[PDB]
Structures are given as structure tokens and as C-alpha cells.
Design an enzyme around this catalytic site. Sequence first.
Site, mmCIF file in Angstrom:
data_model
loop_
_atom_site.group_PDB
_atom_site.id
_atom_site.type_symbol
_atom_site.label_atom_id
_atom_site.label_comp_id
_atom_site.label_asym_id
_atom_site.label_seq_id
_atom_site.Cartn_x
_atom_site.Cartn_y
_atom_site.Cartn_z
ATOM 1 N N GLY A 166 -35.878 -13.165 -52.583
ATOM 2 C CA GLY A 166 -35.570 -11.850 -52.544
ATOM 3 C C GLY A 166 -36.447 -10.835 -53.080
ATOM 4 N N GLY A 167 -37.724 -11.155 -53.728
ATOM 5 C CA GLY A 167 -38.491 -10.410 -54.330
ATOM 6 C C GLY A 167 -37.949 -9.890 -55.654
ATOM 7 N N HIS A 185 -42.682 -16.904 -44.009
ATOM 8 C CA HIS A 185 -41.837 -17.026 -45.125
ATOM 9 C C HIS A 185 -40.258 -17.204 -44.715
ATOM 10 C CE1 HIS A 185 -41.788 -16.485 -49.419
ATOM 11 N NE2 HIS A 185 -40.974 -15.518 -49.234
ATOM 12 N N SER A 201 -39.402 -18.771 -52.987
ATOM 13 C CA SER A 201 -40.007 -17.314 -53.193
ATOM 14 C C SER A 201 -39.562 -16.733 -54.490
ATOM 15 C CB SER A 201 -39.348 -16.346 -51.941
ATOM 16 O OG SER A 201 -40.350 -15.208 -51.853
ATOM 17 N N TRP A 221 -30.929 -12.383 -43.692
ATOM 18 C CA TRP A 221 -30.945 -12.234 -44.973
ATOM 19 C C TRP A 221 -30.236 -11.280 -45.852
ATOM 20 C CZ3 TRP A 221 -33.890 -16.454 -46.122
ATOM 21 C CH2 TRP A 221 -34.729 -17.115 -44.847
ATOM 22 N N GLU A 239 -47.159 -17.578 -44.334
ATOM 23 C CA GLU A 239 -46.454 -16.968 -45.389
ATOM 24 C C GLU A 239 -46.458 -15.283 -45.197
ATOM 25 O OE1 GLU A 239 -44.477 -18.063 -47.496
ATOM 26 O OE2 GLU A 239 -45.183 -20.196 -47.764
HETATM 27 C C1 LIG Z 1 -34.866 -4.127 -49.293
HETATM 28 O O1 LIG Z 1 -35.997 -4.318 -48.665
HETATM 29 C C2 LIG Z 1 -37.310 -4.618 -49.606
HETATM 30 C C3 LIG Z 1 -38.142 -5.734 -48.721
HETATM 31 N N1 LIG Z 1 -37.921 -7.035 -49.160
HETATM 32 C C4 LIG Z 1 -38.486 -7.754 -47.795
HETATM 33 C C5 LIG Z 1 -37.810 -8.057 -46.618
HETATM 34 C C6 LIG Z 1 -38.819 -8.328 -45.617
HETATM 35 C C7 LIG Z 1 -39.309 -9.711 -45.511
HETATM 36 C C8 LIG Z 1 -38.149 -10.976 -45.376
HETATM 37 N N2 LIG Z 1 -37.169 -10.641 -46.237
HETATM 38 C C9 LIG Z 1 -36.062 -11.700 -46.182
HETATM 39 C C10 LIG Z 1 -36.434 -12.895 -47.029
HETATM 40 C C11 LIG Z 1 -37.109 -13.863 -46.507
HETATM 41 C C12 LIG Z 1 -37.427 -15.035 -47.250
HETATM 42 C C13 LIG Z 1 -36.993 -15.261 -48.534
HETATM 43 C C14 LIG Z 1 -36.149 -14.224 -48.994
HETATM 44 C C15 LIG Z 1 -35.890 -13.142 -48.326
HETATM 45 C C16 LIG Z 1 -36.651 -9.351 -46.734
HETATM 46 S S1 LIG Z 1 -37.510 -7.924 -50.327
HETATM 47 O O2 LIG Z 1 -36.757 -7.097 -51.036
HETATM 48 O O3 LIG Z 1 -36.617 -9.167 -49.928
HETATM 49 C C17 LIG Z 1 -39.012 -8.690 -51.180
HETATM 50 C C18 LIG Z 1 -39.559 -7.865 -51.914
HETATM 51 C C19 LIG Z 1 -40.672 -8.295 -52.794
HETATM 52 C C20 LIG Z 1 -41.425 -9.470 -52.495
HETATM 53 C C21 LIG Z 1 -42.459 -9.982 -53.426
HETATM 54 C C22 LIG Z 1 -43.019 -11.135 -52.905
HETATM 55 C C23 LIG Z 1 -42.285 -12.054 -52.018
HETATM 56 C C24 LIG Z 1 -41.081 -11.944 -51.577
HETATM 57 C C25 LIG Z 1 -40.476 -10.339 -51.656
HETATM 58 C C26 LIG Z 1 -39.351 -9.904 -51.135
#
Ligand SMILES: COCCN(C[C@H]1CCCN(Cc2ccccc2)C1)S(=O)(=O)c1ccc2ccccc2c1
Length: 527
Positions: free
Chosen positions: A114-115, A436, A196, A80, A323
Amino acid sequence: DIIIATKNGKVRGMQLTVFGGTVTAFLGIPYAQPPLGRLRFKKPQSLTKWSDIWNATKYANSCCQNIDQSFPGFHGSEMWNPNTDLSEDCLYLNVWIPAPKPKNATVLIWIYGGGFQTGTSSLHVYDGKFLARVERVIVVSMNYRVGALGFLALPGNPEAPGNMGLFDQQLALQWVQKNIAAFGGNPKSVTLFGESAGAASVSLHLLSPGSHSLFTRAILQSGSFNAPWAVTSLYEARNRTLNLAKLTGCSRENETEIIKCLRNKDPQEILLNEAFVVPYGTPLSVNFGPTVDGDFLTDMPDILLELGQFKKTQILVGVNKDEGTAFLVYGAPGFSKDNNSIITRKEFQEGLKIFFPGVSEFGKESILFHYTDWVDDQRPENYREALGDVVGDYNFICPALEFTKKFSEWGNNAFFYYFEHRSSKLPWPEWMGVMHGYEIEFVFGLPLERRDQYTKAEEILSRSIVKRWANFAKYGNPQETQNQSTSWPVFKSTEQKYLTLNTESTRIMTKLRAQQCRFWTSFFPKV
Ligand SMILES: COCCN(C[C@H]1CCCN(Cc2ccccc2)C1)S(=O)(=O)c1ccc2ccccc2c1
Ligand SMILES: *[C@@H]1O[C@H](CO[C@@H]2O[C@@H](C)[C@@H](O)[C@@H](O)[C@@H]2O)[C@@H](O[C@@H]2O[C@H](CO)[C@@H](O)[C@H](O)[C@H]2NC(C)=O)[C@H](O)[C@H]1NC(C)=O
Ligand SMILES: *[C@@H]1O[C@H](CO[C@@H]2O[C@@H](C)[C@@H](O)[C@@H](O)[C@@H]2O)[C@@H](O[C@@H]2O[C@H](CO)[C@@H](O)[C@H](O)[C@H]2NC(C)=O)[C@H](O)[C@H]1NC(C)=O
Ligand SMILES: *[C@@H]1O[C@H](CO[C@@H]2O[C@@H](C)[C@@H](O)[C@@H](O)[C@@H]2O)[C@@H](O)[C@H](O)[C@H]1NC(C)=O
Ligand SMILES: *[C@@H]1O[C@H](CO[C@@H]2O[C@@H](C)[C@@H](O)[C@@H](O)[C@@H]2O)[C@@H](O)[C@H](O)[C@H]1NC(C)=O
Ligand SMILES: *[C@@H]1O[C@H](CO[C@@H]2O[C@@H](C)[C@@H](O)[C@@H](O)[C@@H]2O)[C@@H](O)[C@H](O)[C@H]1NC(C)=O
Ligand SMILES: *[C@@H]1O[C@H](CO)[C@@H](O)[C@H](O)[C@H]1NC(C)=O
């Protein structure tokens, strides 16, 4: 050689061999002026004409972002992380067109998740060449700014209005409107899909009037704007914008001056500070995300949703069986990808503190109570499964269900799916289940590639899903009409039928997670 004239100039693509056929790929077409210098934090500016042949033959830079460093060298996390250079100069998109060049093809626009802090269109599981080759659709995907560079909010102020990443997305949609006909595409037949935060983005485009004419239909995979992580309030946004100014020594009183100070800071400086603009983070924190800017978003989206103020069109919505599990190994005590993560009651209780830091004691008790009346008090997975379900239900499944109910109450056809197949190439351990984001490879047709150790059953599932997605885009109806498939009924707020996706038997079921979601959707908002 294959050159396409576009409104801002000529782009050269490249030919790809796919399944004994040919797809033309235009990787890395710019769609906006690089948002650099004084343009950092502003809405994306229009791109000035060029005269050369833009060589769109490789993915472009990904937007600045923090990288997951939790499992260095582990494909499950690193698949990712971005696979092109990071740079503020990242406003580019990609086009896959079938060969022979189509005549009037339906267009599929991908918006990654990616949140709102991470992500990039160039990832292997977002490769659109399979969809182009197999279904004769055109696939477009774009990079959009994330994190503070994409969503820092000084509401009213155009130097930092918020929602810039959304306006990036929007600007790419306009590009498709003005140019896709030249590539063989039908601008009148555009389906947005995303997962997402990408899915929440899609749902916000249904709400934003500036997007209503840039697409036809919408697909939402594991995400919607009413999810608790998807929209920052004007309050938090300002308190977070102000906090970041402190940690960078940019605090001022002239709100425009704090932005100018942030404009001479290095992308890295802004990035290391994003994590601490909140007092108590969680693995699900979205420090800088969509806000009610008064531009893209004219009011709080829950109110718009509830009072039927959105584009009237068909939607395809769904979620995955597990999820929540993916976030448990980023903080929850006793969890690890390297053991079966049996946890005790106290550990479950501690995990709720991790994931619900600001919630009252009684609130957390009420979560525990609703999820810990066991069919088997003696089953040792009980608390481990329960915490996963808590996170998944609260964060993805119940908001997606509530979104689908409310949207369909205004008359449009909605289709809901429940993806419950674990990838045989899933590198995370089994207790995390159908995680997820691990439907995406199936949607993009990777299991169609026989060279990639997916099972035969997975090829057939991806093949049906690809047909259903494409039928939904072309025709607003996600059926597989030929191979005696189970018919996908519309989701109605009364019966609430949904379709399960799996290698075994596709089934029609009703009222997904009914008891769980009544807790989340009508008790929990009170606390
Ligand atoms: C830089 O690190 C920050 C943590 N992140 C989560 C990690 C762990 C989970 C796996 N993902 C990869 C991934 C999987 C599927 C689709 C897209 C990406 C990375 S994040 O920045 O990506 C993030 C933040 C807040 C969110 C809130 C709601 C839903 C998802 C979120 C993801
Ligand atoms: C609004 O922001 C303040 C400031 O946050 C602090 O400073 C930032 C630069 C960053 O380092 C944060 O992690 C800090 O917490 C918040 O006030 C702080 O709150 C925590 C716990 O609530 C407390 O321990 C600190 O002493 C507080 N500091 C100050 C200066 O008040 C405040 O809570 C934020 N508002 C909300 C609703 O969260
Ligand atoms: C499952 O693993 C977690 C994670 O701990 C790490 O991973 C293990 C596989 C092993 O390499 C440990 O040495 C690592 O620390 C375990 O959680 C830790 O447990 C120890 C005591 O067992 C405790 O002191 C730590 O605080 C825990 N750390 C975290 C982050 O939770 C957990 O106990 C293991 N449980 C089972 C059932 O295997
Ligand atoms: C753009 O690319 C031109 C040729 O590219 C190369 O030749 C063609 C036939 C393809 O095989 C392609 O994949 C190759 O990379 C160059 O002649 C031209 O100078 C390039 N323009 C740039 C780099 O600005
Ligand atoms: C291309 O096709 C256009 C029609 O698109 C169709 O109608 C809209 C309302 C959507 O439902 C879409 O999914 C349909 O496929 C024509 O109007 C247009 O003139 C055609 N142009 C060319 C060049 O073929
Ligand atoms: C459907 O199945 C095809 C192979 O199955 C054969 O052909 C179909 C049309 C039926 O008549 C069936 O009884 C036969 O056994 C695949 O080649 C094709 O890709 C499948 N299509 C989808 C969308 O899943
Ligand atoms: C904020 O900065 C702008 C731009 O320089 C200026 O016009 C405005 O007066 C300032 N507002 C203050 C100092 O309150």
C-alpha cells in the site's frame, strides 16, 4: 469452542469450513497498546495483561488512511480499499491454524503493501484460511500504522522517531515468537512474506538487527527496499514533517511542541494534508515512509545491502510482467481503464513529466531514448507499452533484480520468479496485462475455491504456487517435487536464472530485462 491461552490472556477463535475441512481463525488479536493520545507517533508500547476471554472472532479496525476514490464503484480499485472501520486503535493481528491443531507447524507472516500509505490485513485477497487448510501452515497477518501516523520522522526525537509502522510489524513478530507455540506453531520456522511496500518491509527486516531473531526466511513479491519509493532520506523526512506542521498550523521551534500540536489534531486533518507535503506528487509518491532512524535502520540500506550487512538466509523474490500499468490510469494523460489508452509521443513525453517531475530535461530525454527504439515504429501500442514498462522497470523489476543479485553474492540461496499470468477474474482491461498485486490471490490460494469462477488452469497454477511457497517456508527450497514440475534453480549473480509462472509452460529463463535494468541501475542514478 476453542480457547487459547496467550501470554497476555485468553483468546477465543472460531471454526471455519474450508474444502470439506476445518480451519480455526483468530481474527483481531491485539498486539500492542492502542497508539492513541500521547502514544500517537510513538513506537508501539507493550500490551498489558487482560483477564477476560478476548473474542477474536472478526477483523479489527484498520489503521487510519486515505482511500482510493478514483474509481468509485469499480471492483478493480475498491477491492484494495479497507473493509473494516478506520481508527488509530488498529494494532491487531490474525491467526489461521489448521484443524486438527498442528503439532509444530511452520508459520507464514503476511505484511501487506500500500505504498506505506494504505492497506489492511483484513482484505479478501489476504485471507489465510486456504494456506492453513491446504498446506497445514499457520498464517499470521498484522495491521501496522501507515502514512504520517506510521512514519512521520523527527529523527532522534522519540515522540516522532520515524519507522513506527515497522516497529509495529516487529512487535507482531515478537508476538509470534512468544505465543505461536501455544497455537501449534513453530517459532523457529517463520517465513515473512509481503507484497509491494509489504515486500520492502520484509527486506528491511532482513536489514534490521532487531528483527534478525524473529524469523527464518523471507519472500518478496513485487518490492524491495532499494526501490526508489521505499526509503525517505533524513532530508525529505524532516522537510515533510516540517511541511505538515505548517498545513496544520502546528509550526513551532520546540520540535517536541510541534509534535504535541500534531497530537491534538484529528486523524482526518493529518490525512488531508499528507498529499501536499511534497511539491510535485506522482501516483507513486510515498510521502511518509521508512527512514534511517538510527534504530530500526542504522545506516542507509543500500550501503548495508552492498556490504553484506543483513540476515543470512534464503530468499524468494519475484515480480509481475506488467508492474507499471496500474499507475498509468492515476494521472498519465491519455490513459484510462475505459479505453485502450493508445497514446502519442507527446503524450508519452507528458507522462514522463507526471512520473519523473523533479528529473532534468536530459534525464527524461534519456528515458525516452532508451525505451523508444522500436522493433516496429508503426505499431500503435508502442508508447503505451513503453510508459508502463518505464514505470514498472524503474519502480519494481530492476530494484528487485538488483536486490536479489546483491543479496545472493553473500552466499545464500535465492530464488527469482516472473509472474506472467493475467487473472481471468481481473476487472481491469487487457492492455494493463499482469498487474501489480494480482499474483496475491494466486499465492493465497483463492483460485483453489471452485465456487469462484477461476479457470481450471488457474486452480492448477495456484496449487503449484501454494506448494512452492509452503515448501520454501518449511524447507527453504521452493520446489514442487511430485507433479513432475520444472525445477526452480537458485538465482546466481553470474547466470541469473529465474522461473516463469504461468498457465502455459513454466520455463527457466536468464537475465530478466537485462538491457532495461542496466539503464536504470547504472546510468539513471547519475542524473
Ligand atoms: C490513496 O491513494 C494513493 C495511491 N495508491 C495507489 C493506488 C493505485 C494502484 C493500486 N493500489 C492498490 C494496491 C495494489 C497492489 C498492492 C497494494 C495496493 C492503490 S497507494 O497509496 O496504494 C500507493 C502509493 C505509493 C506506492 C509506491 C510504490 C508502490 C506502490 C504504491 C502504492
Ligand atoms: C521543502 O518544503 C518547502 C515547502 O513546501 C511548500 O509548502 C508546503 C506547506 C506545501 O504546500 C508544498 O506543496 C509547498 O511547495 C518547499 O518549498 C516550495 O517549493 C515549491 C516548488 O519547489 C515552490 O513553488 C514554493 O514557493 C516553495 N515554498 C517555500 C516556502 O520555499 C521545498 O521545495 C521543499 N524542499 C524540497 C527539496 O522539495
Ligand atoms: C481515453 O480516455 C481518456 C480519458 O478521458 C475520459 O475517459 C473517456 C473514456 C471519455 O469518457 C472522456 O470523455 C473522459 O474525459 C481520454 O483522455 C481525455 O481526452 C480528451 C479529448 O479526447 C481530453 O480533452 C482530456 O484532457 C483527456 N483526459 C485525460 C485525463 O487524459 C483519451 O483521449 C481517450 N483515448 C482513447 C484513445 O480512447
Ligand atoms: C464473547 O462471546 C461469548 C459467546 O460468543 C457466542 O457464542 C459462541 C458459542 C460462538 O458461537 C460465538 O461465535 C458467539 O458470538 C459471549 O458469551 C461473551 O459474552 C462474549 N464476550 C464479550 C463480547 O466481551
Ligand atoms: C519444534 O521444531 C523445532 C525445530 O525446528 C526446525 O529447525 C529450525 C532450525 C528451522 O530450520 C525449522 O524450519 C525446522 O522445522 C524443535 O527444536 C522444537 O523443539 C520442536 N518443538 C515442539 C514442541 O515440537
Ligand atoms: C498434483 O496432481 C494431483 C492430481 O494428479 C495426479 O496425482 C499426482 C500425484 C500424479 O501422480 C499425476 O500423474 C496424477 O494425474 C493433484 O490432486 C495435486 O493437488 C497436485 N499437487 C500439486 C502440488 O500441484
Ligand atoms: C523542547 O521541548 C522539551 C519538552 O518540553 C523541552 O524540555 C526542551 O527544552 C524544548 N527545546 C527547546 C525549547 O529548544
